[PDB]
Amino acid sequence: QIVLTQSPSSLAVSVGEKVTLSCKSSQSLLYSNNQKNYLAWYQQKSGRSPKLLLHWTSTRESGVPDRFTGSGSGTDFTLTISSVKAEDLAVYYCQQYYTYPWTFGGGTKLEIKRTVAAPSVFIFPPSDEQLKSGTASVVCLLNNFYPREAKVQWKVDNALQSGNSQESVTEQDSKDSTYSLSSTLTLSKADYEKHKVYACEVTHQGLSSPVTKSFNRGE
Amino acid sequence: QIVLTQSPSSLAVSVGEKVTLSCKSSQSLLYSNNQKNYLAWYQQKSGRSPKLLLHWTSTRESGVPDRFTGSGSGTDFTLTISSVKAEDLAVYYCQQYYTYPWTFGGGTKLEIKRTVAAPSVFIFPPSDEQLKSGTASVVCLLNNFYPREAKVQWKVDNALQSGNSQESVTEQDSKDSTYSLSSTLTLSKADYEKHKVYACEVTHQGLSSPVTKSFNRGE
Amino acid sequence: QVQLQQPGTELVNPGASLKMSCKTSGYRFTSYIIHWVKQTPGQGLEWIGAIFPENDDTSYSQKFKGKATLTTDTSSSTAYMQLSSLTSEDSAVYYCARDGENVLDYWGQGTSVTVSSASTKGPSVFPLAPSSKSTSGGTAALGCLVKDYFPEPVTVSWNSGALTSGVHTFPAVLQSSGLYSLSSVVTVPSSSLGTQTYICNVNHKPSNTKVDKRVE
Amino acid sequence: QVQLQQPGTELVNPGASLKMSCKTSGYRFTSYIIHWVKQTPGQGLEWIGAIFPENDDTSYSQKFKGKATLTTDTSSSTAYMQLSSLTSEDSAVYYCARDGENVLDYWGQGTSVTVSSASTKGPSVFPLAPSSKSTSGGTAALGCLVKDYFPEPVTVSWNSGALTSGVHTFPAVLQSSGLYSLSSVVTVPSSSLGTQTYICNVNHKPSNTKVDKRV
Amino acid sequence: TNLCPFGEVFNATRFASVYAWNRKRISNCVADYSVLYSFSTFKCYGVSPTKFTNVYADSFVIRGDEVRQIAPGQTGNIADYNYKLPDDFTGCVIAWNSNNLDSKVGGNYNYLYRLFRKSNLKPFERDISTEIYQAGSTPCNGVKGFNCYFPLQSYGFQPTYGVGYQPYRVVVLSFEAPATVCGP
Amino acid sequence: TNLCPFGEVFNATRFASVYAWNRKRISNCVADYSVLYNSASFSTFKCYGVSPTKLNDLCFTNVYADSFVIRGDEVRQIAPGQTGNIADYNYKLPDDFTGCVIAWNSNNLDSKVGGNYNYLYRLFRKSNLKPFERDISTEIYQAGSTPCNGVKGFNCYFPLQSYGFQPTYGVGYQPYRVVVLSFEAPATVCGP
Ligand SMILES: *[C@@H]1O[C@H](CO)[C@@H](O)[C@H](O)[C@H]1NC(C)=O
Ligand SMILES: *[C@@H]1O[C@H](CO)[C@@H](O)[C@H](O)[C@H]1NC(C)=O
């Protein structure tokens, strides 16, 4: 089995920067008869299927932007992006078609480094319909922020909550290169009707002071 | 033209102390549409370009320690350092981007307070290479001392020297919060060979005297 | 119109076998070979094997030999992969692709296989209402909470496809129940809350459940 | 890899004009506006002006209207500032900075302008040797003397960058000659003096002079 | 049962600006492209030029130098801020010179384009915003000034201009359940 | 006055494979086409751009007789505007074809107990043959991106297959000998 090694597994780069991604092979992918290297490059954006960018190491497909270039011979191959753009956020894979079994590399995720943006915090009360089912979900939205690291604390009547919250983070946007986070505090209808002030406190680099968004049952 | 007034111009603080720096504006830097204040904070350490710490008053840039915090609205703004460290030694400036012309404040120079440290005094006799040129330079080093006040008087054969000495003092160190001084006595090689004892007399608070460091020419 | 079409989702009991389809269109099926690729979530691409529709010649990776059987129907222009003794480790997205003039240029959407003894359960959609206390600068957030669904996935659209900007559909989280929950939020002008009406359209193709919930 | 590069030093005969560059890299030049700032030594930051590379629109402080002209070359991705009838006040460090979402995150190293009719002179480097005061606390002081140079500045490094601890490079003093002089000293273990080798690296870019002196 | 109306798009007396591009849905009718294929450009992508549930007709006027930007994988003010084609595009792009109709002596300033936008347009996105663009940290408040510029510029088509700066009418046909647009 | 040597083409003991089809120039002679049409030993005698009946009195600048063996099902493909393996990768006729296609069963001569492996056809080609184009190549066909090296494997296959004509086979899979007469150097082949 031919082994393709991609380093780094992940890299973060600024817009307008040049990125060089590497593919190293255990065996030579050079065909002596044609002087062609049988390596291909694919781009997988989040939520989408893989798309061929380059074949024969350097030959770009129709529709593929001029910034994408391929280079290398034998065992050491490279993919070059000149002036990386925000839509270039994707995981890039190298494949060999020199021999079967066909093999793919681990992949390298291009991530975008941007300027710190503070989160906009939103608090959502549980719906009347959900309560009829006996469960209460309190949702906090932190929207459009960089860096990805942010801390959400749930306080009910000034009581810190542990184990009742789950969080999801969006993938970096193709335009603003930011992230959005949702925390859902899930509690019984009974516990919900026992307390009044439900609050979400957010700590992030862009915020000098912690930001708390709150609501009282009935307001 | 918007006028930014920073008070005080200079302040000295101990390590671990909280520091509040002030920027006052002639006109409001609040924009009604976004409700954001157009002020930025910069730190310039000695011999270095200015570094942005905060933008929009409260937004910290990437890599800025969380000790640096921003607050204020309209005409009054504050930069707060919680637990100042010795590396926080810099001149801090405020800039307004609300209107053009863009304007900067005078700056606040943060100095660090420290326990008294006596200098370590060393004398360096002139090099043989320099004597070939016909010039003799005797260097006295006062090293790692606080407070900055220090006096160096040169005595050649117990005769006080005037007009032949120049002194330079370093800026406070980022680690020990101390100062260092160099006095150079410049004489012709001819005068150098007419005298035997070259002495540096040092006055400092941590030093319990006018202290003498001496060398004999040829010895 | 070269199209490789695969079912989006399959649910398999553990210990059983799944046969999945790759219907092909827009080209002579016999002319082009079909490759099968596996992606475990958050991880890379792994080659399973390939079939030439003319003679049913097959090549496999040593890992998938005895786990995967490739077959073809020339009349239906459909290629099939059969996986055996399914385990949680086999829970992944399986893709079908065509080796054309230049490597794999035509790929399918992918089939997500969940190995569970659990039944398909449809989503419960609850409204995330904007604040009357608004505004923080003229911007308001409203949303839909999709809860108690298995298996993945769910698709949420706002205003029947008209609302595309300001929309964040968050990745789903597995709850202790073994069911998935997600939130979909849109940032909208606060002025519009009285004028425009915001309805979220939720589709769970696994259960054929479609729900439209009006927010405020 | 957004880089704004400025020439380090300019020596200008008094009454003359200087045009200074801000070469840019890592970004679309036309997209971001370039600001120019002046700092007189021992003094604060002063905004001179800003230029938009797309249309060459300019905004200036009242003091610099008629003293500073801002220009752009799209092909070279370079911004230029020209000053007229240079005087002693014009002797300062001039900074080029880039506006962005974070305001002036990207700044240049600086260009130091000396308004003098004087000529560039290279430094003569002489050693300050560790002395027979063994031992001064288990620690010994050694150094290099950089002397007879114009204009400022000279850069001193120790052991090619390896030695950064205990190093004090003193601010330069103007001698009556019209030439500057400095001393660089490093405090090192006396045990190392026989074994380790201490070399000072002196660079005076204005005279294109680099001296490596061992102590 | 109806003949598909390509004529209502191609032979339209008036054409839109690239920023305000127009789309017509072609559906429930019979469509022939050998008849269509008089045109400077007729490139088909994803399909073969020599040899679909719905067809979309996008029509606008651009300069001749900028026809190349109406293609997959292309970067420029028109692709970046006016009309964007997906890199996975399946469809046909057709253009022709309109100097006789879209140029005027003294200039035709009615055709406009976007020179400034914060983000590149997503594939098949339209921005008809006429808001002042902030090129800097200082706020604009709907007023022009330094950092503050109107986002749209005029082609100013003039008759004696060179072909590159002359007007071109571009129709992009985008090919996209059942089927209601059938090749007879 | 010398009669054209059609007997060489029609009554050749061994015919060629469709991939390696044979062409004989007919020139400087007199040929009676009607004698062939009324020969009545031919299952197929189709004339395009001409009538078999009037062929007897006409002259042509150049005549080419192309001879090969194909199966009975594939005789339909040796005609203008036809698609299939023989038409696409073995023998192609122009859409503007002027000439006659004549065919007869050769099971008595070209079939063997155990099979006749000598007759071959091309199943795989990168492109379709242009009219009157002969490819006698025996190189390994690449159906995939991976290279072959003259060696077979997955994606790599020999491009020719054998009819394997056997006597008790059905008429469609049985051997048929086909002669294509092509007509358009001054006229050198006059009919009586
Ligand atoms: C436009 O009009 C001309 C003249 O009648 C005609 O030849 C042409 O086919 C028309 N175009 C379309 C697309 O109908
Ligand atoms: C082939 O031989 C038969 C029998 O002799 C004869 O009738 C026929 O004319 C010959 N073929 C040709 C074209 O001469």
Classify residue F145 as exposed, middle or buried by CB count within 10 Å of its CB (0-12, 13-18, 19+): buried
Half-sphere exposure of A181 (CA within 13 A, CB side): 22
Residue A147 preceded by cis peptide, ω within 30: yes
D40 within 8 A of D48, measured Cβ to Cβ: no
At position F151, the amino acid (one-letter code) is: V
What is the rounded distance in angstroms from the CA atom of residue F74 to the CA atom of residue F163? 12
Q: Does A122 touch chain F (CB under 8 A)?
A: no
* Residue D125: closest CA among D177, D193, D203, D8: D203
Tokens of C169: 């559909």
Question: Taking CB atoms and an 8 Å cutoff, what residues of chain D touch A115?
Answer: 100-102, 105
Q: Does A3 touch chain B (CB under 8 A)?
A: no
What is the rounded distance in angstroms from the CA atom of residue F134 to the CA atom of residue D2? 62
Are F154 and C103 an interchain contact pair (Cβ–Cβ within 8 Å)? no
Residue D147 backbone dihedrals phi, psi, to 5 degrees: -140, 160
Q: Is F1 in the pocket of ligand 2 (CB under 6 A)?
A: no
Residues 6+ apart with CB under 8 A from A70: A39, A41, A53, A54, A57, A58, A59, A60, A77, A78, A79, A80
- The ligand that comes nearest to the alpha carbon of residue F102 is 2
What is the rounded distance in angstroms from the CA atom of residue C75 to the CA atom of residue C157? 37
- Pick left, alpha or beta for residue A157 (phi over 0 → left; psi -120 to 50 → alpha; otherwise beta): left
Q: Does B93 touch chain D (CB under 8 A)?
A: yes
Handedness of CA F29, F35, F36, F37 (dihedral sign): positive
What is the rounded distance in angstroms from the CA atom of residue B160 to the CA atom of residue B168? 20
Experimental method: X-ray
The continuous run of DSSP H or E covering C192 comes out as helix C192-195
- CATH number of the domain encompassing residue B74: 2.60.40.10
At position E50, the amino acid (one-letter code) is: T
What is the rounded distance in angstroms from the CA atom of residue A143 to the CA atom of residue A119? 5
Q: How close is the Cα of F42 to the center of ligand 2, in Å?
A: 12
Max CA-CA distance within chain C? 69
Are A116 and D26 an interchain contact pair (Cβ–Cβ within 8 Å)? no
Classify residue A119 as exposed, middle or buried by CB count within 10 Å of its CB (0-12, 13-18, 19+): buried
Question: Collapsing DSSP states into helix, strand and coil, what is residue E121?
Answer: coil
Q: How far is CA B199 from the centre of its chain?
A: 28
Tokens of E47: 């399909």
In chain D, what are the helix, strand and coil shares in percent, each to the nearest 5? 5, 50, 45
- Pick left, alpha or beta for residue F168 (phi over 0 → left; psi -120 to 50 → alpha; otherwise beta): alpha
Residues 6+ apart with CB under 8 A from D212: D199, D200, D201, D202
At position F20, the amino acid (one-letter code) is: A
F171 within 8 A of F105, measured Cβ to Cβ: yes
What is the rounded distance in angstroms from the CA atom of residue C25 to the CA atom of residue E103? 46
Tokens of E68: 């190349």
Are A16 and D100 an interchain contact pair (Cβ–Cβ within 8 Å)? no
Residues 6+ apart with CB under 8 A from D4: D22, D23, D24, D25, D34, D96, D97, D98, D106, D107, D108
Examine the domain organization and report whether F18 and F65 are in the same domain.
yes
The continuous run of DSSP H or E covering F45 comes out as strand F44-48
Examine the domain organization and report whether E63 and E77 are in the same domain.
yes
Q: How many domains does chain F have?
A: 2
Q: Is E75 in the pocket of ligand 1 (CB under 6 A)?
A: no
Handedness of CA C112, C116, C122, C127 (dihedral sign): negative
Closest B-chain CA to E145: B100
* Residue C32: closest CA among C84, C101, C82, C93: C101
Examine the domain organization and report whether D71 and D163 are in the same domain.
no
Q: Whose CA is nearest to atom 14 of ligand 2?
A: F7
Residue A152 backbone dihedrals phi, psi, to 5 degrees: -115, 125
* Residue A7: closest CA among A86, A70, A92: A92
- CATH number of the domain encompassing residue C86: 2.60.40.10
Q: C-alpha angle D163/D169/D174, rounded to 5°?
A: 155
What is the rounded distance in angstroms from the CA atom of residue C144 to the CA atom of residue C214? 9
Handedness of CA D23, D27, D28, D29 (dihedral sign): negative
SS (H, E, C) chain A: CCCEEEECCEEEECCCCCEEEEEEECCCCEECCCCEECEEEEEECCCCCCEEEEECCCEECCCCCCCEEEEEECCEEEEEECCCCHHHCEEEEEEECCCCCCEECCCEEEEECCCCECCEEEEECCCHHHHHCCEEEEEEEEEEEECCCCEEEEEECCEECCCCEEEEECCCCCCCCCEEEEEEEEEEHHHHHHCCEEEEEEECCCCCCCEEEEEECCC
Tokens of C102: 């230049």
| Chain A from 25 to 54: CB within 8 A of any E CB | 51
What is the rounded distance in angstroms from the CA atom of residue D132 to the CA atom of residue E93? 87
Residue E72 preceded by cis peptide, ω within 30: no
- F185 is in which domain, residue-wise? 1-114+167-192
- The ligand that comes nearest to the alpha carbon of residue E173 is 1
Q: Which of C115, C141, C163 is the last residue of a domain?
A: C115
- B16 is in which domain, residue-wise? 4-113
Q: Whose CA is nearest to atom 7 of ligand 2?
A: F39
DSSP state of C102: S
List C-alpha distances in Å: F4 to C112, F8, F25, F188.
72, 9, 10, 10
What is the rounded distance in angstroms from the CA atom of residue E91 to the CA atom of residue E12? 21
Helices (H) and strands (E) in chain E — how many of each? 4, 11
Q: Whose CA is nearest to atom 2 of ligand 1?
A: E11
- The ligand that comes nearest to the alpha carbon of residue E32 is 1
What is the rounded distance in angstroms from the CA atom of residue F64 to the CA atom of residue F99? 10
Nearest-atom index, ligand 1, CA of E9: 13
Max CA-CA distance within chain A? 79
Tokens of C194: 């009285």
Are B33 and E138 an interchain contact pair (Cβ–Cβ within 8 Å)? no
What is the rounded distance in angstroms from the CA atom of residue D3 to the CA atom of residue D104? 13
Residues 6+ apart with CB under 8 A from C72: C29, C34, C51, C53, C56, C78, C79, C80
Of B33, B55, B98, nearest to E138 by CB-CB distance is B98
Q: How far apart are the first and last CA of chain E?
A: 11
Of A51, A130, A143, nearest to C126 by CB-CB distance is A130
Q: Which of C115, C144, C171 is the last residue of a domain?
A: C115
Beta bridge partners of A119: none
F67 within 8 A of F16, measured Cβ to Cβ: yes
Residues 6+ apart with CB under 8 A from D94: D6, D20, D36, D37, D38, D48, D81, D110, D111, D113
At position C128, the amino acid (one-letter code) is: L
Q: Is E10 in the pocket of ligand 1 (CB under 6 A)?
A: yes
DSSP state of C90: G
> Where would I find the beta strands (DSSP E) of E80-135?
91-97, 112-114, 133-134
DSSP state of C88: G
What is the rounded distance in angstroms from the CA atom of residue E178 to the CA atom of residue E174? 17
Are B52 and D103 an interchain contact pair (Cβ–Cβ within 8 Å)? yes
> Where would I find the beta strands (DSSP E) of chain D?
3-5, 9-12, 18-25, 34-39, 45-51, 58-60, 68-73, 78-83, 92-98, 106-107, 111-115, 124-128, 139-149, 155-158, 167-169, 173-174, 180-189, 199-204, 209-214
Tokens of C174: 């597995």
What is the rounded distance in angstroms from the CA atom of residue B104 to the CA atom of residue C49? 66
Half-sphere exposure of D158 (CA within 13 A, CB side): 22
What is the rounded distance in angstroms from the CA atom of residue F29 to the CA atom of residue F185? 14
Q: Does A14 touch chain D (CB under 8 A)?
A: yes
Handedness of CA E43, E49, E54, E55 (dihedral sign): positive
Q: Give me the helices (H) in chain B, please.
A: 128-133, 189-193
List C-alpha distances in Å: C93 to A39, A81, C43, C121, E90.
24, 28, 11, 20, 26
What is the rounded distance in angstroms from the CA atom of residue E74 to the CA atom of residue E70? 7
Bridging pattern class, strands B10-14 and B108-113: parallel
DSSP string covering B139-169:
EEEEEEEBSS--EEEEEETTEE--SSEEEEE
What is the rounded distance in angstroms from the CA atom of residue F172 to the CA atom of residue E171? 52
At position E146, the amino acid (one-letter code) is: F
Taking residue D55's Cβ as centre, other Cβ atoms within 10 Å add up to 12
Tokens of B172: 């406070």
Of E137, E141, E145, nearest to B97 by CB-CB distance is E137
Examine the domain organization and report whether C96 and C10 are in the same domain.
yes
Residues 6+ apart with CB under 8 A from E13: none
What is the rounded distance in angstroms from the CA atom of residue D54 to the CA atom of residue C14? 63
Resolution (A): 2.9
Q: How close is the Cα of F6 to the center of ligand 2, in Å?
A: 8
* Residue E26: closest CA among E7, E46, E50, E49: E7
Residue B8 preceded by cis peptide, ω within 30: yes
CA distance E112 to chain B (A): 29
Question: Taking CB atoms and an 8 Å cutoff, what residues of chain C touch E47?
Answer: 1
Examine the domain organization and report whether D99 and D45 are in the same domain.
yes
Examine the domain organization and report whether F139 and F173 are in the same domain.
no
Residue C153 preceded by cis peptide, ω within 30: yes
Q: C-alpha angle C40/C45/C51, rounded to 5°?
A: 110
F127 within 8 A of F73, measured Cβ to Cβ: no
Are A63 and E45 an interchain contact pair (Cβ–Cβ within 8 Å)? yes
Counting CB pairs under 8 A, whether chains C and A reach 3 or more, is yes
What is the rounded distance in angstroms from the CA atom of residue A210 to the CA atom of residue A57? 50
What is the rounded distance in angstroms from the CA atom of residue F120 to the CA atom of residue F123? 10
List C-alpha distances in Å: C192 to C123, C130, C183, C187.
28, 12, 21, 11
Q: Whose CA is nearest to atom 11 of ligand 1?
A: E7
Examine the domain organization and report whether E97 and E31 are in the same domain.
yes
Bridging pattern class, strands F59-60 and F189-190: antiparallel
Q: Does B32 touch chain C (CB under 8 A)?
A: no
Examine the domain organization and report whether E127 and E168 are in the same domain.
no
Q: Is E7 in the pocket of ligand 1 (CB under 6 A)?
A: yes
Residue B189 backbone dihedrals phi, psi, to 5 degrees: -60, -35
| Breaks in chain B after residues, C-to-N cutoff 2.5 Å | none
Examine the domain organization and report whether E165 and E143 are in the same domain.
no
Classify residue E29 as exposed, middle or buried by CB count within 10 Å of its CB (0-12, 13-18, 19+): middle
What is the rounded distance in angstroms from the CA atom of residue B45 to the CA atom of residue B92? 9
Examine the domain organization and report whether F138 and F75 are in the same domain.
no
E146 within 8 A of E138, measured Cβ to Cβ: yes
- A28-34: which pairs have CB atoms within 8 A and are 24 or more residues apart? A28/A74, A28/A75, A28/A98, A29/A2, A29/A74, A29/A75, A29/A77, A29/A96, A29/A98, A30/A73, A30/A74, A31/A98, A31/F147, A33/F147, A33/F149, A34/F147
Q: How close is the Cα of E25 to the center of ligand 1, in Å?
A: 19
Question: Collapsing DSSP states into helix, strand and coil, what is residue B69?
Answer: strand
Nearest-atom index, ligand 2, CA of F6: 13
Q: How many domains does chain C have?
A: 2
Q: Is E6 in the pocket of ligand 1 (CB under 6 A)?
A: yes
Q: Which residues of B156-166 are buried (b: 16+ CB within 10 A; e: fewer)?
A: beeeebeeebe
What is the rounded distance in angstroms from the CA atom of residue A124 to the CA atom of residue C32? 53
Q: Is F33 in the pocket of ligand 2 (CB under 6 A)?
A: no
Question: Collapsing DSSP states into helix, strand and coil, what is residue D164?
Answer: coil
What is the rounded distance in angstroms from the CA atom of residue B81 to the CA atom of residue B66? 9
Q: Which of D73, D88, D115 is the last residue of a domain?
A: D115
* Residue D77: closest CA among D21, D34, D35, D23: D23
CB pairs under 8 A between B and C: 4
Of A120, A168, A186, nearest to C170 by CB-CB distance is A168
Taking residue B139's Cβ as centre, other Cβ atoms within 10 Å add up to 21
Nearest-atom index, ligand 2, CA of F9: 13
- D107 is in which domain, residue-wise? 3-115
Question: Collapsing DSSP states into helix, strand and coil, what is residue D22?
Answer: strand
| Breaks in chain C after residues, C-to-N cutoff 2.5 Å | none
